[PDB]
Structure 1
Amino acid sequence: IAALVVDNGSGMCKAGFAGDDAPRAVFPSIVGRPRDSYVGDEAQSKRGILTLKYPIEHGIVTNWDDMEKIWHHTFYNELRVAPEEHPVLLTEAPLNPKANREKMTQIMFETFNTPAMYVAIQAVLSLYASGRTTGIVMDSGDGVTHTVPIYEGYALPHAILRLDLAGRDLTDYLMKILTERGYSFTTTAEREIVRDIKEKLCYVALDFEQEMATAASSSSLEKSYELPDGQVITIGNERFRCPEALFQPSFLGMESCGIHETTFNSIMKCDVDIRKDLYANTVLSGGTTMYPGIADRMQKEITALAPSTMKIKIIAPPERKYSVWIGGSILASLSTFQQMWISKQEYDESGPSIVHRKCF
């Protein structure tokens, strides 16, 4: 009876039931094969002797056998449900290729036999989770930092900007700058350790230059971390130097603009009459937004870029790491949304192309 919600990601898949407040199964989006096949956490235990592939790259699905395997794992192994009995809502990256939408709809209706389903833009769900219909969502995750302006529930494709700058790149940058301090972090397990360090200790400095001056002139920011082997490492300025590769991508050898300038540009590609309601309704989402001080940094940067007489409000929910999935359960539990599902009858009539007319 309950409608499943399956938010997909390059790193982590978040699956649960509508009406809840948090997903019941948040597991890695990986598939491993010997160097049979294993998915997610079961492929996590044998990472040394398995080839871990990421079927979602930069937010867009690239492998479809692997995605079928992940969805089979999500249904028959994580939620312990049968898709034939629930309407399976799904999430798509902004500016998703239409062939990919048709392929996911065909998979839902022809290999899992879901009675109904739907495909929503992840940033639109993140905007819904805050009780909004108009606003710009800065969805920064593990593979891509999308910037999606939305007007009355429609994600304007003429202003959606993409950024190949997300959590994985930040973890690699922290690995590099830890190697630049004498700590050998090159292998995979080193990547997991460095990602844990980044989650636990890193934060976005409100003033990068002043923070570097303070970190060089003192040791108050100097924090400690413990390896699995028992060794204790010490991280100083490197705490606020890793997330800065989102506001200054040149640190990673990228000619991009940074999440703040990407957001301002994506707002500037919009109509002048909806720019006031895009500034004051900036919603942050994704894991790579779970940085202390990132919201105030975004506030200051946008206030610098945006005009000097128009109010700006950066909206960072404490649950923003799940604003997509939350918005997918605030949606798949509404009474009106019960009329938006693509029935198996509608599929059998209109082919996999029904998704273009129903889920727009």
Structure 2
Amino acid sequence: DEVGALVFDIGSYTVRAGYAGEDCPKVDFPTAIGMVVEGPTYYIDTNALRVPRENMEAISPLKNGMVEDWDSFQAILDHTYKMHVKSEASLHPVLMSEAPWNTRAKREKLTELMFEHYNIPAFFLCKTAVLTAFANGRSTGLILDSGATHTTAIPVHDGYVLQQGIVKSPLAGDFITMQCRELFQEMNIELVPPYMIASKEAVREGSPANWKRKEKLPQVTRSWHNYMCNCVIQDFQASVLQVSDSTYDEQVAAQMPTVHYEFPNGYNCDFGAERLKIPEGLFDPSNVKGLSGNTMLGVSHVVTTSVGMCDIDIRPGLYGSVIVAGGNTLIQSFTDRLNRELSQKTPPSMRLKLIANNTTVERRFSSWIGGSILASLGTFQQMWISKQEYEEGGKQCVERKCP
């Protein structure tokens, strides 16, 4: 039943490639990579990426779960194949994830690029929601994925996604990074990335940073500088931010223990209510300045809208199999606040239940674990789009072979 294949989960934040049947992906590496015209070169594992090198250039291969630059996408694929996978593509099928809102044009183009360039024996393109459901062990339910670019509620029914029920919101890791930037600029915190620091000394809490700048820094572009700053900001997020249990109240937030954090440059300080006031926008964007818009939907609002836009007969199943995934879901008390809001807003007639896949591996790599267990099944061995299928039906056979 098992067959040596290659499972790919190419997200806007990180790419996870590995073999089908393993509990974890072989290699997970950031997606927001740089570029250097050595021709354009790309890197993996973050060790060839976060290096000060001459003329770091900007690039965006995949945004919102969709390919933005086919050249950079092909380069990332080639590098993942020859550097970490270290195996010929013709020896292993390829099961790749895709965003539900991916277009037929991009689907067919990816299919033809995988069949005419790498000559893979079999190909399959599955949706991230279906993969998350298959990983969590449910064929019907609502997948809540809060990535770096968007927070999306996707209803899957019997293993198929209902496009008309999908809902998206831009409040995601990008919004959190913007809020962290604004908080730093308001608190007068100079965001210094590590590559600009030569040495530092220990300073008292709240005092200026005593650090020395490197003397032979190479030429780096504003894009690479912002990438390093966003990496630092994401570290700060994972180390500090926490979701409020209930609706954000300034009085209750001013009674919470502060969290100490030290930036790469040595500036160390404690954060109080400002670390809990930022993650509140994910659930209630009405209190976020610079976001003068009520049409934006919080996490619970997105969930409720996605459940409501579906047939009333299946809403009980969605409410009972609400699955939570994504990187942003790792913020402390995020799922607690989500469950509270969903129990408050959901009609008691429909049972509510959230899966407890709270581990980091279970959350961030859910879409890849799903593809792994889906390709490691004997039944799935009949859904493989073969090279002969591509040659006979053409690029358009993808739409009929893999919904």
TM-score range, shorter chain: over 0.9
Deviation at 1:300, TM superposition (A): 1.5
Cα contact 2:164–2:309 (8 A) shared by 1: yes
Q: CA deviation at 1:230?
A: 2.2
1:112 corresponds to 2:118: yes
Task: Determine if contact 1:12/1:29 at 8 Å carries over to the other structure.
Answer: yes
CA deviation after TM superposition for structure 1 residue 125, in Å: 0.5
- Contact kept in structure 2, 1:287 and 1:320, CA below 8 Å: yes
Range 50-59 or range 284-293, more displaced: 50-59
Counterpart secondary structure, 1:315: coil
- Tell me if structure 2 keeps the 8 A contact 1:32–1:47: no
Does residue 240 of the first structure (1) align with residue 276 of the second (2)? yes
Q: Which residue of 2 aligns with 1:33?
A: 35
TM-score by length of 2: 0.84
CA separation of 1:225/1:31 partners in 2, compared to 1, >3 Å: closer, same or farther?
closer
Structure 1, unmatched stretches of 5+, are: none
Return the letter of the residue paired with 1:15: A
Q: Is the 8 A contact 2:36 2:42 kept in 1?
A: no
Residue-pair matches, total: 357
Unaligned runs of 5+ residues in structure 2 are 193-224
Matched, 1:320 2:320: no
CA deviations on 1:124-150 (whole Å, 9 max, x unpaired) are 101111110000001111112221000
- Partner Cα separation in structure 1 for residue 347 and residue 320 of structure 2: 12
Cα shift at 1:31: 4.2
1:177 and 2:206 aligned: no
Q: Aligned residue for 2:174? A: 168
Q: Is 2:246 the counterpart of 1:213?
A: no
Q: For 1:209-238, what per-residue CA distance to the aligned partner results, in whole angstroms no more than 9, with x for missing partners?
A: 34x31332x4x4211112222221322222
Q: Normalized per residue, which structure has more helix?
A: 1
Looking at structure 1, the residues matched to 346 and 231 of structure 2 have their Cα atoms a distance apart, in angstroms, of: 38
Amino acid at match of 1:200: S
CA drift of 1:51 comes to 1.9
Deviation per CA, 1:58-103, whole angstroms, max 9, x where unpaired? 2222211111111111111122222110001101001211000001
Report the equivalent of 1:347: 390
Runs of 4+ residues deviating >3 angstroms: 46-49
Aligned match for 1:129, one of 132, 135, 138 = 135
Larger CA Rg, structure 1 vs 2? 2
The answer to whether the Cα contact below 8 Å between 1:133 and 1:153 also exists between their aligned partners in 2 is: yes
Match of 1:157 among 139, 160, 163: 163
Contact 1:185 1:191 in 2 (8 A): no
Distance of 1:48 and 1:214 partners within structure 2 = 49
Identity %: 38
What letter matches 2:42 in structure 1?
Y
Q: Secondary structure at the match of 2:78?
A: helix
Partner of 1:203: 242
Change (3 A) 1:48 1:293: farther
Is residue 203–residue 292 contact of structure 1 (8 Å, CA) maintained in 2? yes
